């Protein structure tokens, strides 16, 4: 894409120590696929496109960016060690949403609405094997 975006969050890394969990298969298998198949799923499917949205200061607010693509291929990839990093990039995703974007403007809801979920099936996450 656009030089005028930044490279994506890292989905691939030798160097980090990798685990897998019950927890992150539980974020796989039922967090993330309930999130990812959602009507409002799809402007969390992949990065930012700010350069087509013709958000060019969307890079300059959202220093970390995060986005479901990321978090379903690092998920996919074995990249995390705990559930803790995984709900975290879940987190910055909507954080990033809420403060870049005004209140009730249509991803605001959409966010809100895949976030309801996301609490809900957070709460049970399994206890670790
Ligand atoms: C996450 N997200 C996605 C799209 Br598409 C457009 C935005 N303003 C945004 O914040």
Same mark, same amino acid.
């Given at each position: 894409? %656009? ?8 989905? %691939?890394? *030798?160097?980090?120590?990798? @685990? ?8 796989? @298998? =039922?967090?993330?696929? &309930? ?12 990065? =930012?496109? $700010? =350069?087509?949205?013709?958000? *060019? ?6 220093? &970390?960016?995060?986005? +479901?693509? &990321?978090?379903?291929? @690092? #998920? ?6 705990? $559930? ?8 910055? +995703? ?14 605001? #809801? +959409? $966010?809100?609405? #895949? ?15």
């Amino acid at each position: 894409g %656009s030089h005028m975006n930044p490279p994506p969050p890292e989905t %691939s890394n *030798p160097n980090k120590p990798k @685990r897998q969990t019950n927890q992150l298969q539980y974020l796989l @298998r =039922v967090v993330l696929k &309930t999130l990812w198949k959602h009507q409002f799923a799809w402007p969390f499917q992949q990065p =930012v496109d $700010a =350069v087509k949205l013709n958000l *060019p200061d969307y890079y300059k607010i959202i220093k &970390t960016p995060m986005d +479901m693509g &990321t978090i379903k291929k @690092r #998920l996919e990839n074995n990249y995390y060690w705990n $559930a803790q990093e995984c709900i975290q990039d879940f987190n910055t +995703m909507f954080t990033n949403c809420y403060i870049y974007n005004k209140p009730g403007d249509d991803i605001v #809801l +959409m $966010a809100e609405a #895949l976030e309801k979920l996301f609490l809900q099936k957070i709460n049970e996450l399994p206890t670790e094997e």
